[PDB]
């Protein structure tokens, strides 16, 4: 295939095999990861060499619940304190029902998570699909509203009434 | 010290709501001394908790470390245990904390509860010194919320959810085991002698289930086999612990050069004396293997071991099968060729 044994690519080949922690091989029925789409995504989580919260954030961004279920949520992960709470808040803002269910099943409790400030933050999000809450808040509290306005829980009570 | 503690009264009983899980599960609990008489415990469990007297008792002795069972084996084990505990009105005695085989029992209960009706009377007998929150449970006869979140650096373990009742026994210490084994064995002995509703004269049958284990699992198996009423046990092979060693030793009854496993103090220390005593009393051991031997269903393996383990006559076996409401068990075992009914 090359210029006989006189010319070889063995130096670069052995350097690559020295850095073989990142190589992923996809074989039909021989090794694991029989799905190539799983082979690509699982290589990205370990290839980033980041913590569990960063892997969970990446899986949340990709909207792949099974990837986080089979890889991120395993035995002995040692989440930092206050990380699952932030993951739950991010999943709640981005409208990820499957991740909310998975985080609920894996330890987090809604009674301690929900505070007044967190609910205020939830009511003033920009992610997710469109909604008509701003028009209702404008219609309730007088004819005029400032542009850069934070919607307080009093306004939500007024619009509910 | 030489057990110089204060004999204070009990101050923790009621019901706990396991906050955090996706299941709304209630669990009654009491905190009693480890020297409490079995009769009073049975009175509490029968009259205060409104539990009917069981037709069967199952002990789930296993390893303490968080081992992992391979797939296609833990699933069938969980399904068989659930079916045996649900079709037959029975109690399950577990460790209680969320470590070892108790986690497997917990997820088996959790998977069943999402598909079928009914409740399983799972009872956990755990020491008080290992719970992650000794506080948050002192409220007497009042619902106390409990958190299932696990902190790996807390050096303790959380109470396993999906358990119907808890018996928290304390010897006064904190952070060590050994305060519940004797009480659990005494309660099993006292409930075994309890009379079933049938007027034949037979007590509640008791079986033991072994998954994973350790050096003390051989000791408790030997103690079960040496009881004045013998108690059958059931073991598994795909665990990788002394249960697998026991299953291997079940074959070739009376290979002594295979006593090296880097698991105990070399060849100088061995459990071969107790192992060979258990293999001398191997008529009660039952081994469940996937596709190798017979009894491919573990729920059938448990029930068939109880009929032969009682060493009773055909009428008593038929009465037991009638009480368990298992027609197939009597059809395939009791009604065979040459039974000689009185």
UniProtKB/Swiss-Prot annotation, chain B:
Phenotype of the disrupted gene, per the record: Trpm3-deficient mice exhibit clear deficits in their avoidance to noxious heat. Trpm3-deficient mice display reduced hypersensitivity to thermal, but not to mechanical, stimuli in carrageen-induced inflammatory pain. In the chronic constriction injury (CCI) model of neuropathic pain, intraperitoneal injection of isosakuranetin or primidone do not reduced heat sensitivity in Trpm3-deficient mice.
Annotated region Calmodulin-binding: where? 66-89, 174-197
Q: What is the effect of changing residue 79 to A/P/G?
A: Reduces calmodulin-binding by more than 50%
Q: Where in the cell is it found?
A: Cell membrane
User: Organism's domain of life?
Assistant: Eukaryota
The reported effect of residue 83 to A/P/G is: Reduces calmodulin-binding by more than 50%
Which residues belong to the signal peptide in this entry?
none
Family classification:
Belongs to the transient receptor (TC 1.A.4) family. LTrpC subfamily. TRPM3 sub-subfamily.
Tell me how this protein assembles.
Homotetramer. Interacts with TRPM1; the interaction results in the formation of a heteromultimeric cation channel complex that are functionally different from the homomeric channels.
Write out the function statement from the record: Constitutively active, non-selective divalent cation-conducting channel that is permeable to Ca(2+), Mn(2+), and Mg(2+), with a high permeability for Ca(2+). However, can be enhanced by increasing temperature and by ligands, including the endogenous neurosteroid pregnenolone sulfate and sphingosine-1 and suppressed by intracellular Mg(2+). Implicated in a variety of cellular processes, including insulin/peptide secretion, vascular constriction and dilation, noxious heat sensing, inflammatory and spontaneous pain sensitivity.
**Protein name as it appears in the record:** Transient receptor potential cation channel subfamily M member 3
Q: Which organism is it from?
A: Mus musculus
> Which residues of the full-length protein are shown here?
127 to 507 of 1732
